[PDB]
């Protein structure tokens with residue numbers, strides 16, 4: 001038996017629970033701490049089976065029916081004996097799930113952020129304390145699927161599934177179930193998973209600057225006058241924004257290189273240029289992507305047209321659970337990242353938050369971020385190993 005705990009109750013959690021419980025030999029427990037969402041899920045499901053509708057790209061559709069063993073808000077029930085603990089929620093919820101699982105997580109547990117995405121390991125090391133060096137930590141670059149719930153607790157739709165997907169790993173002292181293949185088995189044939197060389201590679205390759213950069217490209221020195229309708233998102237970028245993305249991507253390499261120079265045995269060679277990343281030139285590569293057709297900026301109705309809607313996950317997530325975390329790493333490496341910095345400073349004010357001030361992580365809301373320094377990881381080796389330096393005597 002491969003005992004799996006799925007944390008969350010959103011789109012991904014529905015899909016994962018559905019796809020995972022359908023696998024032979026797997027026991028799925030759903031943990032959700034958001035009020036009484038578990039109780040709402042159970043009551044909604046009843047005695048029926050959970051349904052996942054997959055568009056095969058292209059083989060029409062597929063009916064996947066399965067039932068988890070239990071759906072609970074009690075971490076004791078969901079986490080005890082769990083071989084794999086997978087977090088599929090927006091990163092702001094991650095704190096609570098680590099806190100709830102901590103007294104119950106077994107040494108051989110594989111802890112997976114699906115996503116994830118930045119500072120996930122630092123947060124895990126902090127909350128789980130001494131047990132963090134025992135468990136394994138796995139960080140996936142994004143969600144496996146474009147998916148949405150069609151009916152709460154009962155029905156979820158997969159619009160499309162990724163071809164390839166990468167995940168990083170920090171091995172603990174405990175032997176877990178095999179990370180890559182177990183996660184593959186749970187997901188079926190697609191997406192085909194690959195193991196990234198290093199967790200910092202994954203963290204930097206998340207390209208946290210992208211959405212803040214695109215928003216800065218379209219609304220940088222925005223006069224405060226409306227536009228006829230919602231302008232194109234990715235396909236609506238200018239040349240200067242394509243340069244801006246290149247600048248920030250080079251800074252990513254700079255931090256990677258400096259980590260590799262200062263710390264041998266840590267392979268960060270798969271940290272890439274954003275143009276070189278895919279899976280003519282950068283500008284045209286973004287604009288002529290049929291995966292970006294008809295995707296528009298977040299807009300709200302105002303006087304004489306529509307204004308940008310800055311209250312969105314492009315900044316509320318991607319800054320504190322992305323750019324700040326990369327800035328925290330940059331500081332420790334001794335690499336100024338001016339282009340990244342300028343984006344942080346701008347996106348900061350737009351959401352009414354403050355993390356970075358004069359190139360230093362002293363902002364009012366820096367505590368709600370996952371930058372290593374927030375948790376006390378102030379050196380590169382403390383970032384890499386999770387061990388804080390203690391001198392005597």
Ligand SMILES: NC(=O)c1ccc[n+]([C@@H]2O[C@H](COP(=O)([O-])OP(=O)(O)OC[C@H]3O[C@@H](n4cnc5c(N)ncnc54)[C@H](O)[C@@H]3O)[C@@H](O)[C@H]2O)c1
Nearest residue numbers: 008009010011012013034088089090091093143145146147
């Ligand atoms: N769903 C997609 O098609 C899509 C595609 C690619 C990437 N992603 C990424 O995957 C991640 C997860 O996606 P999702 O669609 O499952 O997210 P979601 O928005 O659907 O998940 C919402 C869930 O978060 C939890 N939650 C919300 N508010 C909370 C709070 N107040 N306190 C405690 N818990 C709370 C609840 O369990 C809720 O069910 C996101 O970061 C997103 O950027 C999503």
